[PDB]
Amino acid sequence: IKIPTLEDIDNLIDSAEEVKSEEDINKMPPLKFPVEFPEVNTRSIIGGNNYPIVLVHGFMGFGRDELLGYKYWGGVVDLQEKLNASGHETYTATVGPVSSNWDRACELYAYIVGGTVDYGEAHAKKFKHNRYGRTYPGIYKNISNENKIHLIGHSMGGQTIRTLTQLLSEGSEEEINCGQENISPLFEGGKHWIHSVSTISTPNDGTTLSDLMPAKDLISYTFGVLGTITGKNKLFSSIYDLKLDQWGLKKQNGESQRDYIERVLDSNIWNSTKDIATYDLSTEGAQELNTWVKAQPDVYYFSWTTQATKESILTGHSVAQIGPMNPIFYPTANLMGRYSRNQKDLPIIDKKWFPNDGVVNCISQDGPKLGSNDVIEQYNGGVKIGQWNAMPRIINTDHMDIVGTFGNVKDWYMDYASFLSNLSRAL
Ligand SMILES: [K+]
Numbered sequence: 001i002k003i004p005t006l007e008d009i010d011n012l013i014d015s016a017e018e019v020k021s022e023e024d025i026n027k028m029p030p031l032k033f034p035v036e037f038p039e040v041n042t043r044s045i046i047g048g049n050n051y052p053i054v055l056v057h058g059f060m061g062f063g064r065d066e067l068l069g070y071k072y073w074g075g076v077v078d079l080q081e082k083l084n085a086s087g088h089e090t091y092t093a094t095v096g097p098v099s100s101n102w103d104r105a106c107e108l109y110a111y112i113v114g115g116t117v118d119y120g121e122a123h124a125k126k127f128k129h130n131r132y133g134r135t136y137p138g139i140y141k142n143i144s145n146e147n148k149i150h151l152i153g154h155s156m157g158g159q160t161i162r163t164l165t166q167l168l169s170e171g172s173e174e175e176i177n178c179g180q181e182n183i184s185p186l187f188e189g190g191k192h193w194i195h196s197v198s199t200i201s202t203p204n205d206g207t208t209l210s211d212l213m214p215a216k217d218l219i220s221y222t223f224g225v226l227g228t229i230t231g232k233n234k235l236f237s238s239i240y241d242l243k244l245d246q247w248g249l250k251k252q253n254g255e256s257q258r259d260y261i262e263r264v265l266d267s268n269i270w271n272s273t274k275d276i277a278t279y280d281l282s283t284e285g286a287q288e289l290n291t292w293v294k295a296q297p298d299v300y301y302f303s304w305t306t307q308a309t310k311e312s313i314l315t316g317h318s319v320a321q322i323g324p325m326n327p328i329f330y331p332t333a334n335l336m337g338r339y340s341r342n343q344k345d346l347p348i349i350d351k352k353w354f355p356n357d358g359v360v361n362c363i364s365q366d367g368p369k370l371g372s373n374d375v376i377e378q379y380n381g382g383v384k385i386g387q388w389n390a391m392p393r394i395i396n397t398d399h400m401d402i403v404g405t406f407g408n409v410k411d412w413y414m415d416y417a418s419f420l421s422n423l424s425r426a427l
């Protein structure tokens with residue numbers, strides 16, 4: 001009926017599942033990776049790679065040094081550590097939790113290479129924000145056409161990694177042509193640093209959760225969800241940063257976390273620019289991204305779809321599955337599960353959009369289709385470069401469960417890392 005905001009923090013905390021110990025997560029049934037790499041049981045794989053994985057969080061995800069150690073990737077299980085311990089070189093990148101995909105891609109570039117974020121003169125002028133952002137040391141500084149990586153992005157992270165791959169490969173005409181000093185190499189094109197792009201629970205065609213909500217309310221709701229993890233009091237402690245430096249929205253000297261959050265929530269940013277996550281998450285905004293962010297011909301693309309709704313036999317609406325769906329997502333799942341729209345200049349939303357994972361419509365997750373020329377095929381026991389390999393649906397699994405909040409997923413990720421290591425070179 002009603003999506004809660006911070007006004008309803010008490011009821012959210014009340015309805016929420018308790019955070020579990022690592023021991024208790026390990027007692028849950030492990031998620032099973034569904035396939036073997038093609039031909040592994042018919043012949044020798046001879047063309048594999050040693051490229052590392054870089055993990056990229058979604059909307060309202062935070063870094064390894066935030067949330068008092070609770071990890072985006074695995075929660076109380078440190079998936080990065082487990083992957084490295086089992087021989088799968090893995091890093092974690094951290095970008096703006098509520099910034100646009102463009103801004104996040106520029107941040108991701110700097111996070112990997114090292115240096116100061118550069119959003120582009122042209123872009124920064126157009127959207128009226130700073131050209132330069134924060135400074136990072138670099139987690140994989142030697143990245144190159146020879147030293148490629150596998151990008152894995154959850155939620156909005158999947159849009160962000162598509163966007164980085166587009167910019168690396170083809171650059172930005174607007175940036176190239178504006179005649180700025182010391183253009184970021186990101187915008188020049190010609191870089192083939194990415195071997196694969198994997199999206200997990202990604203709004204590749206947006207999510208109608210953004211369409212149906214006022215932006216401020218969506219953000220406020222998501223602070224509520226964060227609170228179910230941090231605890232309602234620790235939610236207002238200095239254990240996370242919204243990273244809106246470019247907008248002049250850093251926490252002020254002497255400002256409390258609570259005052260900082262209220263100030264950001266009350267900002268004009270949420271209804272006054274398209275250069276923000278809430279726009280980029282909407283179906284209109286995702287469609288716009290899709291009109292220029294294409295699947296590159298020399299990169300493997302994989303998509304994973306989560307679902308935790310069932311169809312109501314009475315109305316045809318999709319509703320939360322009791323058990324699999326976090327109770328915090330009951331209202332979001334149920335509103336998306338009955339949201340239609342047939343309005344000029346906007347994507348037509350019909351019953352195919354109803355099934356969801358609490359946050360993102362299932363139909364949106366297999367790859368970009370709105371405004372896209374990308375090819376999508378369901379995985380058929382062979383991998384195809386330059387197009388989307390839409391992998392077997394991850395049913396009975398909500399939006400956060402697939403990153404360990406809450407689920408036993410470490411073996412799935414280790415098996416996926418093994419799978420990715422078999423991928424052979426572009427011809
Ligand atoms: K909206």
Ligand SMILES: [K+]
Nearest residue numbers: 324325326398
């Ligand atoms: K769940």
Ligand SMILES: [Zn+2]
Nearest residue numbers: 103119127275
């Ligand atoms: Zn921007």
